[PDB]
mmCIF file of all heavy atoms in Angstrom:
data_model
loop_
_atom_site.group_PDB
_atom_site.id
_atom_site.type_symbol
_atom_site.label_atom_id
_atom_site.label_comp_id
_atom_site.label_asym_id
_atom_site.label_seq_id
_atom_site.Cartn_x
_atom_site.Cartn_y
_atom_site.Cartn_z
ATOM 1 N N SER M 12 -9.697 -2.157 4.562
ATOM 2 C CA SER M 12 -9.479 -3.601 4.594
ATOM 3 C C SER M 12 -8.308 -3.986 3.701
ATOM 4 O O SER M 12 -7.516 -4.841 4.094
ATOM 5 C CB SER M 12 -10.741 -4.341 4.168
ATOM 6 O OG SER M 12 -10.456 -5.685 3.821
ATOM 7 N N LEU M 13 -8.172 -3.330 2.526
ATOM 8 C CA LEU M 13 -7.050 -3.583 1.617
ATOM 9 C C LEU M 13 -5.733 -3.181 2.271
ATOM 10 O O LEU M 13 -4.825 -4.008 2.330
ATOM 11 C CB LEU M 13 -7.224 -2.934 0.222
ATOM 12 C CG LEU M 13 -6.027 -3.111 -0.739
ATOM 13 C CD1 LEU M 13 -5.751 -4.619 -1.018
ATOM 14 C CD2 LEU M 13 -6.269 -2.355 -2.037
ATOM 15 N N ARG M 15 -5.232 -2.899 5.512
ATOM 16 C CA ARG M 15 -5.110 -3.837 6.637
ATOM 17 C C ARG M 15 -4.519 -5.190 6.202
ATOM 18 O O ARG M 15 -3.686 -5.733 6.921
ATOM 19 C CB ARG M 15 -6.471 -4.051 7.338
ATOM 20 C CG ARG M 15 -6.521 -5.221 8.348
ATOM 21 C CD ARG M 15 -5.584 -5.053 9.537
ATOM 22 N NE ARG M 15 -5.188 -6.325 10.145
ATOM 23 C CZ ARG M 15 -5.835 -6.909 11.148
ATOM 24 N NH1 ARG M 15 -6.928 -6.355 11.655
ATOM 25 N NH2 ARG M 15 -5.393 -8.054 11.652
ATOM 26 N N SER M 16 -4.920 -5.710 5.009
ATOM 27 C CA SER M 16 -4.417 -6.989 4.495
ATOM 28 C C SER M 16 -2.897 -6.951 4.233
ATOM 29 O O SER M 16 -2.251 -7.993 4.241
ATOM 30 C CB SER M 16 -5.203 -7.436 3.262
ATOM 31 O OG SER M 16 -4.907 -6.672 2.100
ATOM 32 N N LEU M 17 -2.316 -5.747 4.086
ATOM 33 C CA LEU M 17 -0.863 -5.579 3.875
ATOM 34 C C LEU M 17 -0.105 -5.774 5.210
ATOM 35 O O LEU M 17 1.127 -5.837 5.224
ATOM 36 C CB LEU M 17 -0.538 -4.211 3.248
ATOM 37 C CG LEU M 17 -1.361 -3.758 2.021
ATOM 38 C CD1 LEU M 17 -0.926 -2.394 1.547
ATOM 39 C CD2 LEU M 17 -1.235 -4.742 0.853
ATOM 40 N N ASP M 18 -0.850 -5.876 6.328
ATOM 41 C CA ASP M 18 -0.287 -6.067 7.655
ATOM 42 C C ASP M 18 0.011 -7.547 7.911
ATOM 43 O O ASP M 18 -0.913 -8.365 8.006
ATOM 44 C CB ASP M 18 -1.222 -5.486 8.737
ATOM 45 C CG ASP M 18 -0.713 -5.657 10.154
ATOM 46 O OD1 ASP M 18 0.493 -5.393 10.388
ATOM 47 O OD2 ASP M 18 -1.520 -6.058 11.031
ATOM 48 N N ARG M 19 1.305 -7.881 8.017
ATOM 49 C CA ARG M 19 1.778 -9.246 8.276
ATOM 50 C C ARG M 19 2.812 -9.259 9.407
ATOM 51 O O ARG M 19 3.729 -8.429 9.396
ATOM 52 C CB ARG M 19 2.350 -9.879 6.994
ATOM 53 N N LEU M 47 -5.305 2.254 -8.516
ATOM 54 C CA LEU M 47 -4.840 2.548 -7.153
ATOM 55 C C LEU M 47 -3.419 3.175 -7.168
ATOM 56 O O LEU M 47 -2.552 2.820 -6.383
ATOM 57 C CB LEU M 47 -4.972 1.315 -6.209
ATOM 58 C CG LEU M 47 -6.419 0.784 -6.029
ATOM 59 C CD1 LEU M 47 -6.450 -0.622 -5.447
ATOM 60 C CD2 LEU M 47 -7.239 1.726 -5.185
ATOM 61 N N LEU M 50 -2.177 4.907 -3.734
ATOM 62 C CA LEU M 50 -1.848 3.864 -2.771
ATOM 63 C C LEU M 50 -0.512 3.232 -3.133
ATOM 64 O O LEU M 50 0.322 3.069 -2.252
ATOM 65 C CB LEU M 50 -2.971 2.791 -2.662
ATOM 66 C CG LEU M 50 -2.676 1.541 -1.788
ATOM 67 C CD1 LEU M 50 -2.351 1.912 -0.330
ATOM 68 C CD2 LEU M 50 -3.879 0.581 -1.775
ATOM 69 N N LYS M 51 -0.298 2.909 -4.410
ATOM 70 C CA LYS M 51 0.977 2.329 -4.857
ATOM 71 C C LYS M 51 2.147 3.323 -4.695
ATOM 72 O O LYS M 51 3.237 2.896 -4.316
ATOM 73 C CB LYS M 51 0.896 1.796 -6.280
ATOM 74 C CG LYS M 51 -0.046 0.614 -6.434
ATOM 75 C CD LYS M 51 -0.011 0.180 -7.904
ATOM 76 C CE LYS M 51 -0.560 -1.204 -8.099
ATOM 77 N NZ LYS M 51 -0.914 -1.447 -9.520
ATOM 78 N N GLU M 79 7.208 -4.667 -0.499
ATOM 79 C CA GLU M 79 6.717 -3.945 -1.657
ATOM 80 C C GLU M 79 6.141 -4.887 -2.718
ATOM 81 O O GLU M 79 5.026 -4.651 -3.167
ATOM 82 C CB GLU M 79 7.812 -3.064 -2.270
ATOM 83 C CG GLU M 79 7.253 -2.225 -3.404
ATOM 84 C CD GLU M 79 8.188 -1.200 -3.992
ATOM 85 O OE1 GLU M 79 8.261 -0.090 -3.430
ATOM 86 O OE2 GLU M 79 8.789 -1.477 -5.051
ATOM 87 N N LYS M 80 6.872 -5.952 -3.087
ATOM 88 C CA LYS M 80 6.409 -6.943 -4.068
ATOM 89 C C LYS M 80 5.117 -7.619 -3.568
ATOM 90 O O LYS M 80 4.157 -7.745 -4.321
ATOM 91 C CB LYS M 80 7.507 -7.976 -4.379
ATOM 92 N N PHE M 81 5.072 -7.967 -2.285
ATOM 93 C CA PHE M 81 3.901 -8.557 -1.659
ATOM 94 C C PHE M 81 2.680 -7.607 -1.725
ATOM 95 O O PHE M 81 1.591 -8.047 -2.095
ATOM 96 C CB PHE M 81 4.215 -8.979 -0.207
ATOM 97 C CG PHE M 81 2.997 -9.062 0.678
ATOM 98 C CD1 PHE M 81 2.185 -10.196 0.670
ATOM 99 C CD2 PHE M 81 2.648 -7.998 1.512
ATOM 100 C CE1 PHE M 81 1.054 -10.267 1.478
ATOM 101 C CE2 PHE M 81 1.522 -8.074 2.327
ATOM 102 C CZ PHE M 81 0.746 -9.217 2.323
ATOM 103 N N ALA M 82 2.866 -6.333 -1.343
ATOM 104 C CA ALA M 82 1.807 -5.319 -1.313
ATOM 105 C C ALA M 82 1.260 -5.015 -2.727
ATOM 106 O O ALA M 82 0.048 -4.903 -2.899
ATOM 107 C CB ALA M 82 2.312 -4.045 -0.649
ATOM 108 N N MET M 83 2.139 -4.902 -3.726
ATOM 109 C CA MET M 83 1.713 -4.670 -5.105
ATOM 110 C C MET M 83 0.827 -5.849 -5.582
ATOM 111 O O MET M 83 -0.181 -5.608 -6.241
ATOM 112 C CB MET M 83 2.921 -4.463 -6.050
ATOM 113 C CG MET M 83 3.756 -3.236 -5.719
ATOM 114 S SD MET M 83 2.776 -1.719 -5.619
ATOM 115 C CE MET M 83 3.882 -0.670 -4.795
ATOM 116 N N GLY M 84 1.182 -7.076 -5.178
ATOM 117 C CA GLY M 84 0.450 -8.304 -5.490
ATOM 118 C C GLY M 84 -0.968 -8.256 -4.950
ATOM 119 O O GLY M 84 -1.911 -8.511 -5.694
ATOM 120 N N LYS M 85 -1.131 -7.841 -3.678
ATOM 121 C CA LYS M 85 -2.442 -7.709 -3.005
ATOM 122 C C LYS M 85 -3.283 -6.582 -3.613
ATOM 123 O O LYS M 85 -4.498 -6.713 -3.757
ATOM 124 C CB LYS M 85 -2.280 -7.483 -1.482
ATOM 125 C CG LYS M 85 -2.000 -8.751 -0.688
ATOM 126 C CD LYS M 85 -3.229 -9.124 0.125
ATOM 127 C CE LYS M 85 -3.180 -10.505 0.724
ATOM 128 N NZ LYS M 85 -2.337 -10.553 1.943
ATOM 129 N N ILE M 86 -2.622 -5.492 -4.000
ATOM 130 C CA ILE M 86 -3.260 -4.340 -4.627
ATOM 131 C C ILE M 86 -3.772 -4.742 -6.003
ATOM 132 O O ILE M 86 -4.915 -4.428 -6.326
ATOM 133 C CB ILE M 86 -2.317 -3.077 -4.636
ATOM 134 C CG1 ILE M 86 -2.064 -2.565 -3.174
ATOM 135 C CG2 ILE M 86 -2.917 -1.966 -5.512
ATOM 136 C CD1 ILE M 86 -0.781 -1.658 -2.934
ATOM 137 N N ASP M 87 -2.971 -5.489 -6.783
ATOM 138 C CA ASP M 87 -3.387 -5.934 -8.128
ATOM 139 C C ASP M 87 -4.480 -6.990 -8.089
ATOM 140 O O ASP M 87 -5.363 -6.979 -8.953
ATOM 141 C CB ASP M 87 -2.204 -6.389 -8.990
ATOM 142 C CG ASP M 87 -1.236 -5.281 -9.393
ATOM 143 O OD1 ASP M 87 -1.693 -4.112 -9.570
ATOM 144 O OD2 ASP M 87 -0.027 -5.585 -9.582
ATOM 145 N N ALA M 88 -4.428 -7.901 -7.091
ATOM 146 C CA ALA M 88 -5.429 -8.954 -6.900
ATOM 147 C C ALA M 88 -6.744 -8.290 -6.516
ATOM 148 O O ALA M 88 -7.792 -8.754 -6.937
ATOM 149 C CB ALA M 88 -4.996 -9.898 -5.798
ATOM 150 N N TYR M 89 -6.695 -7.199 -5.730
ATOM 151 C CA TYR M 89 -7.919 -6.490 -5.363
ATOM 152 C C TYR M 89 -8.607 -5.947 -6.660
ATOM 153 O O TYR M 89 -9.803 -6.150 -6.845
ATOM 154 C CB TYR M 89 -7.638 -5.367 -4.349
ATOM 155 C CG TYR M 89 -8.841 -4.468 -4.144
ATOM 156 C CD1 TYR M 89 -9.858 -4.819 -3.260
ATOM 157 C CD2 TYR M 89 -8.999 -3.301 -4.892
ATOM 158 C CE1 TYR M 89 -10.997 -4.031 -3.119
ATOM 159 C CE2 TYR M 89 -10.141 -2.513 -4.768
ATOM 160 C CZ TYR M 89 -11.120 -2.863 -3.852
ATOM 161 O OH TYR M 89 -12.222 -2.063 -3.695
ATOM 162 N N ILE M 90 -7.843 -5.233 -7.505
ATOM 163 C CA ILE M 90 -8.250 -4.674 -8.811
ATOM 164 C C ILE M 90 -8.790 -5.789 -9.718
ATOM 165 O O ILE M 90 -9.890 -5.648 -10.249
ATOM 166 C CB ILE M 90 -7.059 -3.937 -9.478
ATOM 167 C CG1 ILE M 90 -6.645 -2.687 -8.692
ATOM 168 C CG2 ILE M 90 -7.369 -3.606 -10.919
ATOM 169 C CD1 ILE M 90 -5.247 -2.120 -9.106
ATOM 170 N N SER M 91 -8.034 -6.906 -9.854
ATOM 171 C CA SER M 91 -8.420 -8.086 -10.638
ATOM 172 C C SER M 91 -9.731 -8.664 -10.117
ATOM 173 O O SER M 91 -10.544 -9.115 -10.917
ATOM 174 C CB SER M 91 -7.359 -9.176 -10.545
ATOM 175 O OG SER M 91 -6.069 -8.700 -10.885
ATOM 176 N N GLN M 92 -9.930 -8.677 -8.780
ATOM 177 C CA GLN M 92 -11.160 -9.209 -8.181
ATOM 178 C C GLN M 92 -12.369 -8.314 -8.473
ATOM 179 O O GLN M 92 -13.420 -8.842 -8.770
ATOM 180 C CB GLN M 92 -10.995 -9.458 -6.677
ATOM 181 C CG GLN M 92 -10.258 -10.750 -6.342
#
Side-chain angles (χ1 to χ4, degrees), residues 12-13 15-18 47 50-51 79 81-91:
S12 163
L13 177 60
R15 168 63 205 269
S16 73
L17 312 179
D18 179 45
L47 300 163
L50 173 59
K51 294 181 163 162
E79 185 173 275
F81 156 82
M83 297 307 164
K85 280 252 168 79
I86 293 159
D87 292 328
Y89 170 83
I90 294 165
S91 307

